[PDB]
Each structure stands twice: as C-alpha cells, then as structure tokens.
C-alpha cells in the first residue's frame, strides 16, 4: 500500500475513463506480475492491467482465447469471461467477474481425503481432456512452437551476453541445447493448452472440488505435454510428481515418460528462460538470478 494509494487511484481513474459507465466504489491490489498488476474492484470484478510491455499483442490473444473458450467449452468449471477490455501498446486492461473460491496449495491438498484428492484429479483431467480435444481452427493464429522459440532465444543469447558468461554457464547452456536437439518430445500432438497450468491458477469450492481456472495469458496451440509440466513438478509451490502422474493416467492416451521428459527439459531450461527475460526486458536482476541458479543447479548433488 501507498501513502497516496496512488496506484489504486490512477487505475481507478483509468477504469472509469475507458469504461464509460463504470463506477468504482472499491478497489484494491490483489496480485501482480513481472509487468502487470491485478485489481479487485467493487469486491466483484477482476481487472488485469499492464503498461508498455515487451510482449505486445499479449492481452489481445488472451482475450481471444477467453472468447474462444467461453463459446466452445462445455464444462461446469468457470473461467474468466471478459466484459471490459481496453487494448493499446501503452496500456491494456481486461475486466471480468471474479471467480469465487480458494486457490489450491500443497497444504490444502494435504488435508483432503483420498477420495477428495481423486475427484480433484479427475476434474483436472476431464477439463484438460475437453480443452485439448477442441477443434482450434478458429484460433489457429494463437500457435506457439517452444523448440523454435528456444532456438531463437539461444541465438539472442549468442548475439548479446553469451561471450561474457563463465565456462560453467556456457556448459550448462550447451548441455541443455544438446538435449533439446536429441529429444523427440516436440513431435507429438499439438493442441490448445492453458500453458501455465500450475496450482496457483486453480480454484476450489467449499467441497474442495475444482470450480474455476484463471490466467490463460500464456495459452496457445502447443504440445499436449505442456499442460502437465507443473502438475508433474516437484517443488514447494506445487503438489508433487505423483499428482501429475495420476492425472496423466486419468487423462489417458498419452505417453507418461515423454510428458516427464518434457517437464524435465523445461525445468532444465528455467534459468536460461530467466536470463532471456532479463535480456529482452532490460532487467539485470533477472539475468543475475538465472546465472546464479545455474551455479546452484550445477553444485546440487
């Protein structure tokens, strides 16, 4: 919070300016990202906002995805439904009715009965099955090639800071690139994926059932494996590897060992992704964090 509550005031002003008949009675910051801030307005609406950003056309795609899904999905699981939007280079805002519920965490999962956990898993698999099964023709432009993206990111590294890196850093990168070249995990089914499908985006109702999913801001047509990456993740923020496995078995018709290889490859990539983000957005701290993380990983066992 600020002394002038300046942030909330500016955003109040912008919301009321751009959405002619919209009246802000209350407004608080409910989240923030790398270059975004999310607000809860009138205890009822979520407004996601961003100023000038490296990924332009970002809130436009995300909007198009919400519209495609609200038209085409048949599910009881809620997702954002965009009522207000303002999109420009210098400012983008998306407003939708807040989905009510509690975000899944490791702690909450641990308190659930075995059966509750099973049902949650079933609900997740069933949603992913339905989304991955959609004919995505009407959003065929929202395509993401991860391998190619990584190859282009590697070139950017080589054109920028690569020569200043340590040998240890270089070896980490090259060793990953060799793995990227040898793997077959990009050669499988492509489909519409959420693509940031981690438990901080999953909402539970009062019966610990899946009631909503948020933040399709990275969604697109991509490898089917993508949506299992965080479900398979072993970390403090995610539930655990067995959670993802079970979900994969419920989901069915998918090579689990390849999903894991996909996840493991993306995990290996994370510090490099972090470096790249720092380069592209001119934020040194990200470059430094990624490089340090390479050393932590190098010295792990």
Ligand X SMILES: Nc1nc2c(ncn2[C@@H]2O[C@H](COP(=O)(O)OP(=O)(O)NP(=O)(O)O)[C@@H](O)[C@H]2O)c(=O)[nH]1
CB of 35 to Mg ion, least distance (A): 11
Residue 3 annotated as binding site = no
Closest CB to ligand X among residues 173, 208? 208
Q: Which helix (H) or strand (E) holds 8?
A: helix 6-18
* CB proximity list for 198: less than 8 A, separation 6 or greater: 230, 231, 233, 237, 238
DSSP string, 128-148: HHHHHHS--GGGTT-B--HHH
> Which residues are bridge partners to 204 per DSSP?
102, 210
Per CB under 6 A, does 94 bind ligand X? no
- Contact (Cβ atoms closer than 8 angstroms) between residue 213 and residue 203: yes
Per CB under 5 A, does 288 bind Cl ion? yes
How many CB atoms within 10 Å of residue 229? 24
Which range binds Cl ion by CB under 5 A, 129-137, 146-154, 244-252, 284-292? 284-292
Q: Which of 9, 26, 33, 234 touches ligand X by CB under 6 A?
A: 33
**What binding mask, one character per residue, do residues 164-203 give for ligand 51G by CB under 6 A, x or -?**
--------------------------------x-x-----
Catalytic residue among 35, 145, 196, 264: 196
CB of 195 to ligand 51G, least distance (A): 7
* Phi, psi (deg, nearest 5) at residue 131: -70, -45
- Contact (Cβ atoms closer than 8 angstroms) between residue 7 and residue 36: no
Instruction: Report what 271 binds from ligand 51G, ligand X, Mg ion, none; CB cut-off 5-8 Å by kind.
Output: none
CB of 270 to ligand 51G, least distance (A): 5
Q: Which helix (H) or strand (E) holds 38?
A: strand 37-41
Q: Which of 98, 169, 227, 233 touches ligand X by CB under 6 A?
A: 98
Residue number of the CB closest to ligand X reads 31
With vertex at residue 244, the alpha carbon angle to CA 239 and CA 248, rounded to the nearest 5 degrees, is 160
255 is catalytic: no
Q: Which of 104, 169, 238, 278 touches ligand 51G by CB under 6 A?
A: 238
Per CB under 6 A, does 202 bind ligand X? no
Q: Which helix (H) or strand (E) holds 222?
A: strand 220-223
> Which residues are bridge partners to 5 per DSSP?
none
Q: Which of 13, 51, 103, 270 touches ligand 51G by CB under 6 A?
A: 270
* Phi, psi (deg, nearest 5) at residue 220: 175, -175
Query: By the criterion CB under 5 A, which residues form the site for Mg ion?
Result: 215, 217
Distance (Å, rounded) from C-alpha 170 to C-alpha 24? 51
Q: What residues are designated binding site? A: 215
Residues forming contacts to ligand 51G in the complex (CB under 6 A) are 196, 198, 218, 230, 233, 235, 237-238, 267, 270
Residues forming contacts to ligand X in the complex (CB under 6 A) are 30-31, 33, 36, 38, 46, 48, 80, 98-99, 200, 214-215, 217
């Amino acid at each position: 919070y600020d002394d002038n509550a300046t942030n909330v005031k500016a955003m109040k002003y912008l919301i009321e300016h751009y959405f002619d008949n919209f009246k802000v009675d209350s407004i608080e910051i409910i989240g923030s990202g790398y270059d975004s801030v999310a607000y809860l307005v009138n205890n009822e609406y979520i407004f996601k906002t961003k100023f000038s950003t490296n990924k332009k056309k970002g809130y436009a795609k995300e909007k198009a995805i919400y519209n495609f899904l609200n038209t085409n999905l048949e599910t009881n699981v809620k997702i954002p439904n965009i009522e207000y939007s303002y999109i420009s280079d210098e400012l983008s805002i998306l407003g939708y009715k807040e989905i009510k519920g509690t975000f899944l965490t490791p702690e909450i999962y641990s308190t659930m009965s075995e059966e509750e956990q099973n049902l949650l898993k079933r609900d997740i698999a069933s949603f992913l099955r339905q989304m991955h099964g959609l004919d995505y023709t009407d959003i065929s432009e929202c395509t993401i090639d991860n391998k190619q993206n990584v190859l282009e990111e590697y070139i950017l590294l080589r054109e920028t800071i690569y020569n200043d890196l340590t040998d240890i850093e270089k070896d980490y990168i090259e060793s990953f690139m060799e793995r990227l070249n040898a793997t077959t995990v990009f050669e499988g089914k492509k489909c519409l994926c959420h693509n940031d499908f981690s438990c901080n985006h999953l909402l539970l109702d009062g019966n610990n059932r899946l009631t909503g999913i948020i933040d399709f801001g990275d969604s697109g047509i991509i490898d089917e494996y993508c949506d299992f990456i965080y479900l398979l993740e072993d970390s403090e923020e995610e539930i655990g590897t067995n959670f993802g496995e079970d979900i994969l078995r419920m989901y069915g018709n998918i090579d689990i060992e390849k999903a894991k290889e996909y996840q493991d490859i993306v995990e290996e990539y994370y510090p490099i992704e972090t470096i790249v983000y720092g380069i592209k957005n001119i934020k040194q701290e990200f470059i430094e964090n990624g490089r340090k993380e390479i050393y932590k990983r190098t010295y792990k066992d």
